[PDB]
């Protein structure tokens, strides 16, 4: 047994499933994309696409 806990906050979960949903809140809202080839990060899946082709 134990406690499925955030660790980042360490102070919150609604449940184990609650924590699972809550765990992703620290990735943040996805208004960006990470590069397939070199993993550089750009403010959209558009700026990333421009970066991708002229790599
Ligand atoms: Zn948290
Ligand atoms: Zn790249």
Curated annotation (Swiss-Prot):
Expressed in brain, lung, skeletal muscle, heart, pancreas and kidney but not liver or placenta. Also expressed in aorta, ovary, pituitary, small intestine, fetal brain, fetal kidney and, within the adult brain, in the substantia nigra, medulla, amygdala, thalamus and cerebellum. A zinc finger (C2H2-type) spans 4-26, 33-55. It is found in: Nucleus. Transmembrane segments: none annotated. Disulfide bonds: none annotated. It comes from the Eukaryota. Uses different DNA- and protein-binding zinc fingers to regulate the distinct BMP-Smad and Olf signaling pathways. C2H2-type zinc fingers 14-19 mediate the interaction with SMAD1 and SMAD4, while zinc fingers 28-30 mediate the interaction with EBF1. zinc fingers 2-8 bind the 5'-CCGCCC-3' DNA sequence in concert with EBF1, while zinc fingers 9-13 bind BMP target gene promoters in concert with SMADs. Transcription factor that can both act as an activator or a repressor depending on the context. Plays a central role in BMP signaling and olfactory neurogenesis. Associates with SMADs in response to BMP2 leading to activate transcription of BMP target genes. Acts as a transcriptional repressor via its interaction with EBF1, a transcription factor involved in terminal olfactory receptor neurons differentiation; this interaction preventing EBF1 to bind DNA and activate olfactory-specific genes. Homodimer. Interacts with EBF1. Interacts with SMAD1 and SMAD4. Interacts with PARP1. Interacts with CEP290. Belongs to the krueppel C2H2-type zinc-finger protein family. It is linked to Nephronophthisis 14: An autosomal recessive disorder manifesting as infantile-onset kidney disease, cerebellar vermis hypoplasia, and situs inversus. Nephronophthisis is a progressive tubulo-interstitial kidney disorder histologically characterized by modifications of the tubules with thickening of the basement membrane, interstitial fibrosis and, in the advanced stages, medullary cysts. This is Zinc finger protein 423. The lineage of its organism: Eukaryota, Metazoa, Chordata, Craniata, Vertebrata. The chain holds residues 928 to 981 of 1284 of the full protein.
């Amino acid at each position: 047994m134990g406690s499925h806990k955030c660790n980042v906050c360490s102070r919150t979960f609604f449940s184990e499933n609650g924590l699972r949903e809550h765990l992703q809140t620290h990735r943040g809202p996805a208004k960006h994309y990470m590069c397939p080839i070199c993993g550089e990060r750009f403010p959209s899946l558009l700026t990333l696409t421009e970066h991708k082709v002229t790599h």
